[PDB]
Amino acid sequence: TTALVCDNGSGLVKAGFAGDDAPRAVFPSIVGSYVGDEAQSKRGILTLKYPIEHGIITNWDDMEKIWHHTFYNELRVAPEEHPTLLTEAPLNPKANREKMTQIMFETFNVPAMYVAIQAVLSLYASGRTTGIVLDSGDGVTHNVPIYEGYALPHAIMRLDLAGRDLTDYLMKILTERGYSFVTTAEREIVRDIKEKLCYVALDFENEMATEKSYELPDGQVITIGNERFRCPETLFQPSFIGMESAGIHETTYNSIMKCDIDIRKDLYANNVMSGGTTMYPGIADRMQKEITALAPSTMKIKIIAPPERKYSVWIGGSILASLSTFQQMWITKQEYDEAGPSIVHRKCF
C-alpha cells in the first residue's frame, strides 16, 4: 500500500515513505555488523568503510548490510510488503543496475522495484521533465541535462570533487592558518565548520580583497576568515585542489552546448540545483551570474534551488512513486521471474 524510497549516497543514506515531505531516515552510509549511527558510535571496535564511492556501489556485502539495516532497523518495515524505489548515479555501470535489481528481488523479496537516476528525480521534484541539473553530494558532482525525463548521456559532465573534497581542502587551508586538522575525527569537526560557516562569494576577487569564531570540543576558540569562501570556491575553480577540470559553471555551459540546439533555451531556463554541496549561501546567485556571463544575452537563465534541495532527489522519488502514470513502470516480481536482472534496462529509463 505504501512505497519505500531510498536514495543511497556516498556519504548519507536517505530513506523513507512516498508521500512524506522528507526522508524520515537519514544516516551515515558506513558499515563497521554495525551500520550508520550505531556503527560510528562504536568506532573503537570495528573498522568503518563507505560502501559507495563517488556515487557508485563498490562493496556489495556492506551495501546489503546498508539495505537490510534500512528496511529492518531504520524504517522498521518488511521489505516484502512495499514497492521500493532506489536511486543511482548518472553513468552507473549496467552490471551495477542489474546487481541492485537482483539483490532487491532475490535477497529482500520485494514485490516491486524501480531504479531512477538521482538528478532526474531532483528535476522531477521541481515539477519539470526538462532542464539541467547540477547535483552535488559528498562524493561526486554532475551536470545532467534532461529532456522529457531522459538524461542525455552524451552531454552529462562529471566533476570528480564534492563535499568530502571540500572538507579536506578546508582542513588544509585552516591548517595553513596555524591550526591542525588531520585525523578522521578532526575531519568531522571541519565538516561541521564547513556546513555552518562557509559560503560562496558573488565576486571572489572582491571578497578576497575584503570573520567568525568557532569553538572546538577541547574548548579552544578558533577564527575563520577567507577560508569561509575559499573552500567552496573550489567548485568554481578546481585548480585550488590541483584539478585540471573546469568549474561547475563552465561545465554547465559545456553540457548545454553538447545538447541539441533547439533544447538549449529550455536548459538555460530550467537549471536545478540539488544535493548537500549545493547548500552554500550565495551559490545560486553566483551560478546565475556565471552562467549569465557565459551565455548569450538572448537567454533567460533561471536557477531553481529550493530550501529543501539537500533532499530533492529523495523528494523527487517520493513524488514519482505516488503518481498514477508511474504504477505501470514498477518492475514486479513476476516480470523479474520472467526476465531476470536485465529487465532493469527495459523498465527503468
Partner: peptide
C-alpha cells in the same frame, strides 16, 4: 513534496518514446 505532483503527472503523461527522441537527434549514447 506534493505541490508539484499534479504538474509532473501531466508532463510524464505525454512523455515521448526513447526511440522517438533518438530519431529526432536529441537522445544519444555516450
Amino acid at each position: 513534496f506534493k505541490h508539484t505532483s499534479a504538474a509532473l503527472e501531466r508532463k510524464i503523461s505525454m512523455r515521448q518514446s526513447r526511440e522517438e527522441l533518438i530519431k529526432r537527434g536529441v537522445l544519444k549514447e555516450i
